[PDB]
Amino acid sequence: PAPRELEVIRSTYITPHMLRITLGGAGLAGFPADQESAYIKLLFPQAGERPLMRTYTIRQQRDDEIDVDFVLHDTDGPASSWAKTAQVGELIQIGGPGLKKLINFEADWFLLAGDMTALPAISVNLAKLPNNAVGYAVIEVLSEADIQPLVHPEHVELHWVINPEADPEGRPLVERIAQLPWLAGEPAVWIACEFNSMRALRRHFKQAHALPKSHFYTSSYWKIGCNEGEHKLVKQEDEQLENG
Numbered sequence: 001p002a003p004r005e006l007e008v009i010r011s012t013y014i015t016p017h018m019l020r021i022t023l024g025g026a027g028l029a030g031f032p033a034d035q036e037s038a039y040i041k042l043l044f045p046q047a048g049e050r051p052l053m054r055t056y057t058i059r060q061q062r063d064d065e066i067d068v069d070f071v072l073h074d075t076d077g078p079a080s081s082w083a084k085t086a087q088v089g090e091l092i093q094i095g096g097p098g099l100k101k102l103i104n105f106e107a108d109w110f111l112l113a114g115d116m117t118a119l120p121a122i123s124v125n126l127a128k129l130p131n132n133a134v135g136y137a138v139i140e141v142l143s144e145a146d147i148q149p150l151v152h153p154e155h156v157e158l159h160w161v162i163n164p165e166a167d168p169e170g171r172p173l174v175e176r177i178a179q180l181p182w183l184a185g186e187p188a189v190w191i192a193c194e195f196n197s198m199r200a201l202r203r204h205f206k207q208a209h210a211l212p213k214s215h216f217y218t219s220s221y222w223k224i225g226c227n228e229g230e231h232k233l234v235k236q237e238d239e240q241l242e243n244g
């Protein structure tokens with residue numbers, strides 16, 4: 001299967017550390033509908049070698065284009081660097097879409113949590129939740145300026161954790177979450193963030209409040225000190241340890 005060549009239509013700052021690139025062009029023909037929160041693979045040139053791949057979320061989808069929001073993280077990679085320099089009319093090949101994972105809607109209350117890499121996906125889950133949904137969304141951003149006014153059910157509270165430097169100990173997100181009252185009934189939990197933060201969260205829930213995996217999604221989206229290729233190995237190893 002060959003990749004799609006897509007065209008950069010627009011580049012837009014959402015917040016100082018979040019840049020939205022809009023992709024379109026003839027290359028999107030037959031791309032499937034209803035893919036918001038699904039992920040794609042951006043393909044990047046290597047001289048004399050296989051292309052690098054970087055994973056991103058479809059933040060928004062219209063019938064003629066899709067939006068991808070790039071966190072402008074420290075220590076540029078091929079992807080964040082590409083986003084910052086991307087001109088209108090420039091081309092990029094992608095693979096995808098890969099299947100989306102939404103939070104389990106079949107629950108009494110909800111908890112979504114993650115860092116900026118998960119913010120696009122969390123924003124789609126919040127917009128899709130029922131109007132009367134109850135619970136919490138806890139999101140780690142780099143500054144106050146990177147807080148966004150998201151659409152959400154009025155009884156889902158948005159808690160922002162502001163942290164300029166990612167914590168290899170994984171403390172910020174779990175420490176805020178453990179201060180949030182546990183509500184009545186069974187929750188569904190959706191968590192995606194930096195590996196160590198997700199493991200801290202996962203460990204918290206195992207020790208304190210054990211939940212079935214159907215109602216408890218965890219995912220490492222990146223890892224400190226690793227590029228995506230290195231992260232993938234650690235992710236796979238962790239998945240294998242955890243699921244057997």
Ligand SMILES: Cc1cc2nc3c(=O)[nH]c(=O)nc-3n(C[C@H](O)[C@H](O)[C@H](O)COP(=O)(O)OP(=O)(O)OC[C@H]3O[C@@H](n4cnc5c(N)ncnc54)[C@H](O)[C@@H]3O)c2cc1C
Pocket residue numbers: 039054055056057058068069070071072073074075076077078079080081116117118120166220221222223224225226227228229
């Ligand atoms: C399912 C899925 C969906 C994702 N969706 C998005 C999305 O929509 N938007 C988005 O921005 N990211 C998203 N990510 C995370 C993204 O794939 C990684 O951030 C990726 O490493 C960025 O690629 P890069 O080329 O810029 O950096 P890389 O070449 O992979 O790494 C370069 C350096 O930057 C560090 N690094 C990578 N990401 C971050 C970060 N965000 N903060 C601080 N340091 C970082 C690495 O540890 C490494 O040291 C998603 C990840 C997954 C698995």
Ligand SMILES: [Ca+2]
Pocket residue numbers: 134135136155156157
């Ligand atoms: Ca509440």
Ligand SMILES: [Ca+2]
Pocket residue numbers: 177178204208209
């Ligand atoms: Ca708890």
Ligand SMILES: [Cl-]
Pocket residue numbers: 199202203206
């Ligand atoms: Cl664990």
